[PDB]
Amino acid sequence: KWAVRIIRKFIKGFIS
């Protein structure tokens, strides 16, 4: 659970 946020973490590196 909530490991989807890890992919969003990559997004946090992509958007920034």
UniProtKB/Swiss-Prot annotation:
Name of the gene: MYO1H
Homology family: Belongs to the TRAFAC class myosin-kinesin ATPase superfamily. Myosin family.
Clinical condition linked: Central hypoventilation syndrome, congenital, 2, and autonomic dysfunction: An autosomal recessive form of congenital central hypoventilation syndrome, a rare disorder characterized by abnormal control of respiration in the absence of neuromuscular, lung or cardiac disease, or an identifiable brainstem lesion. CCHS2 is characterized by shallow breathing and apneic spells apparent in the neonatal period. Some patients have other features of autonomic dysfunction, including bladder dysfunction, sinus bradycardia, and temperature dysregulation.
Purpose of the protein: Myosins are actin-based motor molecules with ATPase activity. Unconventional myosins serve in intracellular movements. Their highly divergent tails are presumed to bind to membranous compartments, which would be moved relative to actin filaments.
Protein name: Unconventional myosin-Ih
